[PDB]
Structure formats: structure tokens, C-alpha cells
Design a protein around this ligand. Structure first.
Ligand SMILES: CCCCCCCCCCCCCCCCCC(=O)OC[C@H](COP(=O)([O-])OCC(O)COP(=O)([O-])OC[C@@H](COC(=O)CCCCCCCCCCCCCCCCC)OC(=O)CCCCCCCCCCCCCCCCC)OC(=O)CCCCCCCCCCCCCCCCC
Ligand SMILES: CCCCCCCCCCCCCCCCC[C@@H](O)O[C@H](CO[C@H](O)CCCCCCCCCCCCCCC)COP(=O)(O)OCC[N+](C)(C)C
Lengths: 121, 175
């Protein structure tokens, strides 16, 4: 709908070249840590379903789970940030290019505005 | 003693009569008072002076905190959240101070009523009128705000009262 068609957009890129001008998410980002937690939970559920010692059965496969989730999460976060940056860029440009639709109103002080008073009793 | 200020908590000059006994029978109250002070007050005074001279060996000061006078809610734009926050905090502090002022006047009135004995109705007229004035002012400023009061609601109440007063004054001036 709203973002589906935009000028100069490569169809299946998933990460345009203009996204590299944004700060990458830190490796200690809390969302990445949550993705790693999801990987750990997947590994534990894998151990429990297959009737293996849940905490200690397979360490290599649990590590693979955690790193796979973190790896996908990093690029997911990059794309998320890029799309939000595009949204803000477009909104600001549209506000700037249409001044008559977003006019700066007169600043009034609370000493001048008359608000009706509703007593509590 | 000088632990508080005498001008904010005034007391009468404390006139007391002299003992003028009409009989030579021994007075039990005086002998009991001598027994009491000798057997109770003296040890209390020695203990207290020991504690006080222990306190004098290590003495530190704590200072009353001073606050500035930031702009109030009338000098804030309609959606300036920072000026609004400053003004709201200042208004709440002023509300607390006014509460304590009313508390002080109430304490004055209670002390007057207890002290005057059976003449409290006539001898506590000044304290009663002071409490009347302070309570009238406090009532105008904060009554009926309700839970969720704020500087804006107080301002709206004041503006409504001022509008009513101005209308009444200009109507009376048309006679
Ligand atoms: C928000 C904050 C965080 C919360 C997040 C959510 C919760 C945590 C994550 C959830 C997923 C993680 C684990 C899932 C798989 C585990 C399945 C399991 O059974 O576990 C068995 C296993 C014990 O089994 P075992 O030792 O192999 O041998 C006994 C047999 O296996 C015994 O086998 P059995 O066959 O006899 O078992 C039979 C039993 C087995 O049935 C179960 O155990 C239930 C399985 C849980 C369902 C999980 C579904 C997906 C998770 C969703 C959670 C929802 C949360 C939202 C709130 C709603 C609550 C539902 O079934 C029953 O008896 C029927 C009871 C019916 C009750 C119905 C309620 C069940 C659902 C409740 C789920 C709530 C969360 C539970 C989390 C922990 C549960 C183990 O439990 C564990 O040991 C794992 C616990 C966690 C390990 C972490 C330890 C790491 C190191 C510690 C140190 C920490 C850091 C150190 C660094 C500090 C520096 C020094
Ligand atoms: C419970 C969550 C379910 C998640 C479902 C599976 C999770 C893994 C997804 C698999 C990742 C690979 C898919 C694509 C990778 C490369 C292909 C690339 O070209 O895709 C582009 C972009 O990639 C995909 O479009 C986005 C996939 C991202 C999926 C994750 C979002 C999950 C929703 C939020 C829930 C939180 C999940 C957290 C992680 C578990 C397509 O661009 P475009 O041609 O223009 O789109 C056409 C269709 N449109 C415009 C209508 C959208």
C-alpha cells in the first residue's frame, strides 16, 4: 500500500545501498540479545522434545541455534532501522514541500487562554 | 526556649501569682514538689548535660534548602512541556507552603483556646479572625480542585473568579 511503490526502489534488495549511511546496530543491542535468547529457547525446546537432557544435551547445536538467531536478527534490525529512517525522511520532506498544509500557529500563553473550570464537589 | 521563633508562635507575658497562704498548715503540694525535683529532675539534668557536652565534642550543620523563583504557569506557552513542568513543580511547592501556613495559624488558635481558660470566647478573637482570613484565602485558591489538581486548574478557577468579580464590579458601577 503506502510504501509498496516508491521511486528508485530495487525489487528484492532487502538492503539498499543508501542504508549504509546509517549507524549499524551495536552487537550488544538488547534486541539482538533477545534474538539470542530466542535461539537458546529453541535449543532447549529441541532438547526437551527429543527426550534429551534439556540443559546439557547438545552444546554445538544449541550454539548453532543461538548464532543463527543472532545472525538473522542483525540484518532484520538493520532493515527495520532503514525503513523507519525512510519513513521519517519522507514525512519531513513532505512537510517541508507543503508549507500551507502545516502552518505554524500563534504561540499563546496560559495567562491569555481561557479554560473553563469544572469544580470537583 | 530559643529553639523556635517567638514572633511566629507568640505567647502572652505569662503572669503568675505569688503564694499567699491564709493557714500555717503544711502544704502537701510544695513538699511533694521538692521530693519530685530532688528525686527526678536533678538526675535528668545531669544526664542531659552529659549528653549535651558529648554533643559539643562533635558538631555539624545541616542547611535549609533554597529554591529559585522560576516562571509560573501564566508565562508558559500552550504546549511548552519544560516550562509547564517547572511551573507545576513550583506551584506544588507553594501549595505545600500554604498548607503549612494554615497549620501554623491553626496551632496558634488551639494554643489560644487552651491557654485562655474560661475566657477563650472573648480573648481569642484575634486568632479566630486570623484563621478566618487564612482559611478564606486558602479556600479561594485550592478548594474544589479535586484529585488530579494542577496549576492549570487553579489558574482556570482564578480566572473564573476574576471574571465574575469584574462583571459584578462593572454592574455595580452602572448605578
Ligand atoms: C519474562 C522473563 C523471562 C520469561 C520467558 C519465558 C519463560 C522462559 C523461557 C521458556 C522456554 C525455555 C525452556 C523451554 C523448554 C524446557 C522444557 C522443559 O520441560 O524443561 C525441563 C528441564 C528439566 O528437565 P531435565 O533436567 O532434563 O530432567 C527432568 C525431566 O526432563 C522431566 O521431564 P518430564 O517429562 O517429567 O516433564 C513433564 C512436565 C514438563 O512440562 C514442562 O516442563 C512445561 C514446558 C514449558 C512450556 C514452554 C513453552 C514455550 C515457552 C513459553 C513461556 C510463556 C511465558 C509467558 C507467561 C505465560 C506462561 C505460560 O509436564 C508436566 O508435568 C505437566 C504440567 C502441566 C503444567 C502446565 C504449564 C506448562 C506451561 C508453562 C510455561 C511457562 C514458562 C516455563 C519456563 C521453564 C519451564 C521448564 O528444565 C530445565 O532444566 C531448563 C530450565 C531453564 C534452564 C536455564 C539454565 C541456564 C543456566 C543458569 C544460569 C543463568 C545464567 C548464568 C550466568 C550468570 C553468571 C554467573
Ligand atoms: C513469528 C514471526 C514469523 C516470521 C516468519 C519467518 C521468519 C524468517 C523470514 C525469512 C527471511 C528471508 C526472507 C527474504 C530475505 C531476502 C529476500 C528479499 O528480497 O526480501 C525483500 C524484503 O524482505 C522481506 O520482504 C521481509 C522479510 C522479513 C520477515 C521478518 C518480519 C517479521 C514480522 C514482525 C514479527 C517479529 C519477528 C522477529 C524475528 C523472529 C523483498 O522485498 P520486496 O520485493 O519489496 O517485497 C515484496 C512484498 N511486499 C512489498 C508487499 C512486502
Amino acid at each position: 500500500t503506502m510504501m509498496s511503490g516508491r521511486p528508485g526502489r530495487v525489487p528484492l534488495q532487502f538492503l539498499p545501498n543508501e542504508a549504509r549511511s546509517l549507524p549499524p546496530p551495536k552487537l550488544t543491542d538488547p534486541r539482538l540479545v533477545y534474538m539470542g535468547f530466542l535461539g537458546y529457547c529453541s535449543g532447549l525446546i529441541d532438547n526437551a522434545i527429543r527426550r534429551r537432557p534439556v540443559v546439557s544435551a547438545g552444546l554445538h547445536r544449541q550454539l548453532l541455534y543461538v548464532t543463527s538467531f543472532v545472525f538473522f536478527g542483525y540484518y532484520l534490525l538493520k532493515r527495520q532501522d532503514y525503513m523507519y529512517a525512510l519513513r521519517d525522511h519522507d514525512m519531513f520532506a513532505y512537510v517541508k514541500s507543503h508549507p500551507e498544509d502545516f502552518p505554524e500557529k500563534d504561540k499563546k500563553t496560559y495567562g491569555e487562554i481561557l479554560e473553563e473550570f469544572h469544580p470537583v464537589r | 526556649p530559643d529553639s523556635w521563633d517567638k514572633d511566629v508562635y507568640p505567647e502572652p507575658p505569662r503572669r503568675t501569682p505569688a503564694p499567699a497562704p491564709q493557714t500555717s498548715l503544711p502544704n502537701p503540694v510544695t513538699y511533694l514538689t521538692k521530693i519530685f525535683d530532688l528525686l527526678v529532675d536533678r538526675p535528668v539534668t545531669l544526664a542531659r548535660e552529659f549528653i549535651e557536652q558529648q554533643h559539643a565534642k562533635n558538631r555539624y550543620y545541616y542547611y535549609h534548602r533554597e529554591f529559585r523563583r522560576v516562571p509560573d504557569i501564566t508565562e508558559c506557552e500552550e504546549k511548552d512541556i519544560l516550562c509547564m513542568f517547572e511551573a507545576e513543580m513550583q506551584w506544588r511547592r507553594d501549595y505545600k507552603v500554604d498548607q503549612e501556613i494554615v497549620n501554623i495559624i491553626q496551632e496558634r488558635l488551639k494554643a489560644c483556646q487552651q491557654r485562655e481558660g474560661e475566657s477563650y470566647r472573648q480573648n481569642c478573637a484575634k486568632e479566630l479572625e486570623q484563621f478566618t482570613q487564612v482559611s478564606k484565602a486558602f479556600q479561594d485558591r485550592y478548594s474544589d480542585l479535586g484529585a488530579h489538581y494542577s496549576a492549570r486548574k487553579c489558574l482556570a478557577k482564578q480566572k473564573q473568579r476574576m471574571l465574575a468579580e469584574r462583571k459584578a464590579a462593572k454592574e455595580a458601577a452602572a448605578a
